[PDB]
Design a protein around this ligand. Structure first.
Ligand SMILES: COc1ccn2c(C(C)=O)cc(C(=O)Nc3cccc(-c4cnn(C)c4)c3F)c2c1
Length: 113
């Protein structure tokens, strides 16, 4: 049992750290519209889409009752971009940097909960 405001307080700074990354977070700030991006085969590969705005809205309303529910949403977001994008692409590289950032922020947060 974590009460919702404690979870928000502990985890929100970890989402803030990602969101503030410029230019790396930009492709992750909103859902991927595959037709407007000219990538009409996106949902045939990526089965469960996730992005920072979805993660923020769920965290804002208290949908995450356990820390693991939040960590898993963030790794789903990362894993989706690593799957669809080539290892030599701008987007792939942006993804990995964000993850490096996330791991620094998240480790101590999990160690003291
Ligand atoms: C980092 O420094 C600044 C300084 C000022 N702004 C402002 C405004 C309007 O002044 C919006 C933003 C801002 O970044 N808004 C925002 C919010 C969500 C998504 C984007 C965005 C832009 N391109 N993409 C792909 C996503 C976006 F630009 C911003 C950032």
């Amino acid at each position: 049992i974590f009460k919702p405001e404690e979870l928000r307080q502990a985890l929100m700074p970890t989402l803030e750290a990602l969101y503030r990354q410029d230019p790396e977070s930009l492709p992750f700030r909103q859902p991927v519209d595959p037709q407007l991006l000219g990538i009409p085969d996106y949902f045939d590969i990526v089965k469960n889409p996730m992005d920072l705005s979805t993660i923020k809205r769920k965290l804002d309303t208290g949908q995450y009752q356990e820390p693991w529910q939040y960590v898993d949403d963030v790794w789903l977001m990362f894993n989706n971009a690593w799957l669809y994008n080539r290892k030599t692409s701008r987007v792939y590289k942006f993804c990995s940097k964000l993850a490096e950032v996330f791991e620094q922020e998240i480790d101590p947060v999990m160690q003291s909960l």
